Amino acid sequence: CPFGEVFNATRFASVYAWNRKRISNCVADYSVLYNSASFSTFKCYGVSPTKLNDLCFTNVYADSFVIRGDEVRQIAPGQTGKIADYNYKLPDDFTGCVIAWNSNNLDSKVGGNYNYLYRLFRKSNLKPFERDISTEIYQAGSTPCNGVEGFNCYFPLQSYGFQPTNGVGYQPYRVVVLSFELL
Amino acid sequence: QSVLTQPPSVSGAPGQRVTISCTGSSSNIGAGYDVHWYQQLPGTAPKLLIYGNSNRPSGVPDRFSGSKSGTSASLAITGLQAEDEADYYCQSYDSSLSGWVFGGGTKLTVL
Amino acid sequence: QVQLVESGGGVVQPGRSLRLSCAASGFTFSSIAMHWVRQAPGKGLEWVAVMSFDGSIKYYGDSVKGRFTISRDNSKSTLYLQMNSLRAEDTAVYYCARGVQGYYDRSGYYNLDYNYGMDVWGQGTTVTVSS
Ligand SMILES: *[C@@H]1O[C@H](CO)[C@@H](O[C@@H]2O[C@H](CO)[C@@H](O)[C@H](O)[C@H]2NC(C)=O)[C@H](O)[C@H]1NC(C)=O
């Protein structure tokens, strides 16, 4: 019932500002999730598919963003880097079910689309399940000024580049990550 | 000897770009698995450098990047300095032997 | 805080046995897989064995097929490797390296993960087989 709109969606936000959508007090099926070979990776870390038909639908979360193809391998527990230190840090605990699948024809046109953004510079790397939308200059060099973007003062975001003539590891993969909790 | 084949020793001048090739068979790398890369400083324990064919963990700088072109991947060092004289082993996973494979080791030095 | 310290190297005649130790601290040992890798002195690295999350899935390399035995314990956070019928080509520095975690796919069977490397490596002790 509830998540028929979080997979077929025509608009996925970029990674640095995702959309945590909770579902509550409504039935779920999870047979739409498995028995479909359209997905690339269907890793689940704590609980097992074809078993989670228990009383778990107390605010089941579902994050969603878009990253390049060989950075699905940083949406594992642990596994530090540059898309899991500053954008989406999973805990060393129960991540629900990290799900990813190739998308070259939906979020990428012939003109070299670069509309999706990801952070590159952030001191004091992220806690588990925390979002950072604060667009402020880095200021890692000289004395704190009002922001001039000249030298050793970088813009905190950067585009990707999603041409359809790239290989596998530079094409956008629409990653959706479930999460579960109790009371 | 080893399952993966790579050049045993290649080097270059500082500030230039060196390609450490790492080619394998169609049973392990070409089957759909991901290469990785290590850096063993002489006499000590190696560390992870690149995993998932393009990434870099927390701590390794921006100079060490890589790729995976079909059935033969390659590591690429841009702006190499004198403090990187170690060895660089590439590894993968194999479906036939059902075990991890490694490379022959590349002796990279500065001139 | 995260490190893997080992002990247990020595001089063994070819034919008798030895137990290898690999202590663990700084992280959660009770959920992550573990890998053993060895280094011949002068030559390259080679793979030895892997142990899964619970202890039901094990694999070994090509040169150690059957004549080795791996077993761990989550309680005292210590990883063991039992050997018997040793040869003279096993003289190598033995590392224990931390693996990645593990996953259940749709079908639902735990699968050791294959696409990840070995993040943090131990100091590694040397064994010596000679006459
Ligand atoms: C919308 O996405 C969902 C998956 O998130 C799909 O809808 C169903 O998918 C299952 C297999 O996973 C099929 O057996 C069903 O027939 C699909 N539903 C319908 C109404 O066809 C599917 O990928 C997308 N929906 C559609 C209509 O294409």
From TrEMBL, chain B:
One of the GO biological process terms: adaptive immune response
**Where is it located?**
Cell membrane; Secreted
Task: Report the GO terms under cellular component.
Answer: extracellular region; immunoglobulin complex; plasma membrane
Note the InterPro entries from the entry.
Answer: Ig-like_dom (IPR007110), Ig-like_dom_sf (IPR036179), Ig-like_fold (IPR013783), Ig_sub (IPR003599), Ig_V-set (IPR013106), IgV_Light_Chain (IPR050150)
**Disulfide cysteine pairs (residue numbers):** C22-C90
**Key words of the record:** Adaptive immunity, Cell membrane, Disulfide bond, Immunity, Immunoglobulin, Immunoglobulin domain, Membrane, Secreted
Q: What protein name is recorded for this chain?
A: IG c335_light_IGLV1-40_IGLJ3
Residue intervals of the Ig-like domain:
1-91
- Source species of the chain: Homo sapiens (Human)
Query: Mainly resides where?
Result: membrane
Concerning Pfam families, the annotation shows: V-set
What interactions and quaternary structure are annotated? Immunoglobulins are composed of two identical heavy chains and two identical light chains; disulfide-linked.
